Amino acid sequence: MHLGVLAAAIAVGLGALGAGIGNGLIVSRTIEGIARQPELRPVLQTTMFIGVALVEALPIIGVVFSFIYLGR
Amino acid sequence: MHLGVLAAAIAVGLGALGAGIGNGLIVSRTIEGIARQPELRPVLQTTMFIGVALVEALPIIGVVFSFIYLGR
Amino acid sequence: MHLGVLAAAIAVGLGALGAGIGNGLIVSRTIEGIARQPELRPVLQTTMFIGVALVEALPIIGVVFSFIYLGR
């Protein structure tokens, strides 16, 4: 089961990488849009937060799937 | 079947990575477009949501295919 | 045929990654263009949809080819 540790480790690493850069950029860019024009400022950042929920859904479910695949 | 765990783990990791960055950026950029000009604001974000459905279709189907390939 | 599972799994992962980021960005950017100027708004998003068809053609055919290569 030594390979399983790496499989999950790389999968999680991939999950962290994807959501990490996706959300990092999502926050800054969201912020940049708000700064450019003061139109629906709270709403734009709120959309950003839902984006965070959506993007992180993938790494969370990916980790769960990796766990189950290793388990069964 | 030890290799199968890694195959699915990396495939899912790839799926999470692609949709995660694609949707993260899709949300922020969508938001940025809305902020730049107050034209069809609800529609633009709605298009973003359909984009989410389209982009995540790929990781969902990819995971399913990986499962079946391992299974058969 | 254990290697075949990984071959298809990584190929599909690659397919999901390419189209996922390509279409995710295509949707948001398409949206951003429409937001910037209200010129041919329906047409621009329509072009985006055909872009989706074009980009996903690659992962779909790639998956099919992977299946056949494994099969024969």
Place this chain on the structure above:
Amino acid sequence: MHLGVLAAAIAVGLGALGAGIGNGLIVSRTIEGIARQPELRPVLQTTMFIGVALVEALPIIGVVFSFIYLGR
């Protein structure tokens, strides 16, 4: 010939990835350019289509080469 399946699978995956992101971005950006200014709108999108033909030429020929290399 088990390695051959992976060789073609990864090559095609690479082909799908390159053209998929290249064309996805080509469509959205082409669209963005048209939206920014209403100058030679049909021509710009047409150039985009030829771009599609050019970019996909690479994955198509790559797949063919992979097939022949495996074959001979």
Place this chain on the structure above:
Amino acid sequence: MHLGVLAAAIAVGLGALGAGIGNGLIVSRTIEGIARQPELRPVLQTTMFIGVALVEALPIIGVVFSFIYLGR
């Protein structure tokens, strides 16, 4: 357990890579947005900081998961 060291090492490397580029860009872009327009300057940078917390949550949890997978 020699493979375990690499599994965690690459996972952490992936974690550092994702959050490192995500937060690096988040800080500069956040800064760029503030510079472009003097609207809600403290708030925009504050949003950036929460972005940092969100993005680094992934590498921190990823490292923890890698540790546990190696442990059990």
Place this chain on the structure above:
Amino acid sequence: MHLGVLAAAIAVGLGALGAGIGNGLIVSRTIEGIARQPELRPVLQTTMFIGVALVEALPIIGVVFSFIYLGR
């Protein structure tokens, strides 16, 4: 010579990837520049075409080199 097939397959995949994204983006961006300002429109797109010739020179020669290396 089983490894040779993969060597060429990955090299070509790399060639398709580099030129595919390079030319895809070159076409759309070239198009975007023309759209932004109606200055030397034919010339700008022409420069784009020479760019295509230059960028694809690399994958073409790379494939040839891979073939010869396998051959000798």
Place this chain on the structure above:
Amino acid sequence: MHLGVLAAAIAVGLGALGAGIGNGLIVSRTIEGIARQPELRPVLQTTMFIGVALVEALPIIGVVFSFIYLGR
């Protein structure tokens, strides 16, 4: 322990890569924001410096973790 050297070497390489590009871009973009508008110029660059501290925290801790994993 030969694999351990590579594990740390690649982890550090990953650490250098992530922070290197993250901070390189953070410095230039920070600079670009300041150049665009003369608003809170010292503060913006200062935020950039804290960004540097944050981003490099990841590679530093990653290297430390790699060392300990190899050690124990």
Place this chain on the structure above:
Amino acid sequence: MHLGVLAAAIAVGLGALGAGIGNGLIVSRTIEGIARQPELRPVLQTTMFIGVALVEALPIIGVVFSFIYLGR
């Protein structure tokens, strides 16, 4: 010497990838700059050409080095 073929094949693939995307983008962006403002148009594109010479110097020398390393 079977590994040597792959070493050169991947090195060349890397060379084609780097210069291919670097020059593809260099041509389009160069073009975009010229389009934005009609200032020193011939000179800007000329600088682009020297950029091509500089960027391709790397893949050319890399291929030569790979050949010699295999040879000796």
Place this chain on the structure above:
Amino acid sequence: MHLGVLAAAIAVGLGALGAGIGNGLIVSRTIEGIARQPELRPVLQTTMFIGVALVEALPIIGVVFSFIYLGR
């Protein structure tokens, strides 16, 4: 110790890659910011130089660490 050569070779390659693209972009973007507005031109480029020092610190230390890991 044959693996050690590759470990350092890839680590250095990673170091060169990260700082190379980080500093290459840092120089051009820094330059672009200065060109956009003639405000604190020497200072902006100077900040760029310190950025170079910061970014290259990572590859230099990474190479040193790789050397020591191989050594001990």
Place this chain on the structure above:
Amino acid sequence: MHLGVLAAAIAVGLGALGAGIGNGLIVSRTIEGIARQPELRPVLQTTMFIGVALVEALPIIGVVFSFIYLGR
């Protein structure tokens, strides 16, 4: 010493990739900045050239290090 050839080949490939894209983009972007505003045009491109010297310093030294590691 068969692995050594690949180690240097991939390291050089990495070196060419990093500097190739870094300098390719540095030239075009430098050019774009000059085109946007006619301020210190020779100086900006000159800064670009020093950027080239800085960025290529990394691949040159990386290749040298790879050679020595293989040698000793």
